[PDB]
Design a protein around this ligand. Structure first.
Ligand code: NA
Length: 104
């Protein structure tokens, strides 16, 4: 059965650093024939369906890894996200949380 899993549920990141948010999926059940789509969606306070600040690192997809990279994390990146992977009609998702640390 197609499932998504999150190796880590909470990521703690210093303001200004990078983070690679990971969700793993059963690549054996996907085909670039039927298509794969991955999406990191911010749960609260975002007018876009998918996070505009993250980029999927596509080279990991053949390993069943959806890695969503934010190169310079900002305070407003904090909060819960859903990582969604779709392979054809199959899909699953998990939640992860980004906690942003700042020192003033
Ligand atoms: Na937040």
């Amino acid at each position: 059965l197609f499932t998504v899993t999150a190796p880590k549920e909470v990521y703690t990141v210093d303001v200004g650093s990078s983070v690679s948010l990971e969700c793993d999926f059963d690549r054996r059940e996907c085909t670039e024939l039927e298509g794969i789509r991955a999406s990191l969606q911010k749960v609260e306070n975002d007018t876009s369906l998918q996070s505009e600040r993250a980029t999927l690192l596509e080279e990991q997809l053949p390993l069943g890894k959806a890695l969503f990279h934010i190169p310079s994390v900002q305070v407003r990146d904090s909060g819960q996200y859903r990582c969604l992977v779709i392979c054809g009609a199959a899909w699953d998702y998990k939640y992860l949380t980004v906690k942003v640390k700042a020192s003033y």
